[PDB]
């Protein structure tokens, strides 16, 4: 006995939770490789840069302090 009655009011008790925003689980994975294989190598460099930018900081913040 199919009814669908009380179901729309069950889905709205604890609320129909809104979707997660885009900054949640934005895993550009399973997508088109030639993009993510480039958006990978550019992440490696931008991490060598993030590590390098902190290296001068501390060393500038040492001598210049």
């Amino acid at each position: 006995n199919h009814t669908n009655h009380n179901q729309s009011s069950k889905n709205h008790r604890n609320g129909i939770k809104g979707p997660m925003p885009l900054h949640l689980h934005n895993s550009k994975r399973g997508s088109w490789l030639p993009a993510l294989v480039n958006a990978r190598r550019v992440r490696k460099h931008n991490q060598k840069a993030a590590l390098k930018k902190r290296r001068e900081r501390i060393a500038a913040f040492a001598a210049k302090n």
């Binding site: 129909i16 939770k17 979707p19 550009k28 997508s31 088109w32």
Partner: protein
């Protein structure tokens, strides 16, 4: 529950409109999509290779993926007590670049360019005027109303 195929109950939904059939546009082939813009997933027939399921027809959503000839679109789907960000894979012809933001794309384009004109800009050209207020209105034709039979 005899039939629930991938294309069920969709006679009028995928049917082309009246006197507009045949091949897809050259605009729809010359569109330009990025990862992130919005797209109306308006599944048209006459391509019949890459149409999404019925559900994702009036639906618009982010492009999370642009393969060579398939746009990947996330779409919010209110399943039962939560929405899934579905990840559909369709071809480009089933896709419009969604206007849904020209409402403030074109607003803040001239709204700021005049807020700047109003804040700093160069000058402040007067803009749209007031809408709802009073007034001693002068009539131009009197009338009455009783009946018409």
């Amino acid at each position: 529950v005899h039939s629930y195929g991938y294309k069920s109950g969709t006679r009028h939904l995928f049917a082309k409109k009246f006197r507009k059939h045949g091949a897809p546009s050259v605009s729809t082939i010359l569109t330009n999509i990025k990862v992130g813009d919005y797209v109306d997933v308006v599944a048209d027939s006459a391509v019949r290779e890459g149409m999404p399921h019925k559900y994702y027809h009036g639906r618009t959503g982010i492009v999370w993926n642009v393969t060579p000839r398939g746009v990947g679109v996330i779409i919010n789907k209110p399943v039962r007590t939560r929405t899934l960000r579905k990840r559909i894979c369709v071809r480009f012809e089933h896709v419009r670049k969604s206007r849904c933001q020209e409402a403030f794309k074109a607003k803040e384009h001239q709204f700021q360019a005049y807020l700047a004109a109003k804040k700093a800009g160069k000058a402040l050209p007067p803009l749209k005027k007031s809408s709802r207020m009073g007034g001693i209105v002068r009539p131009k034709n009197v009338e009455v109303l009783a009946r018409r039979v």
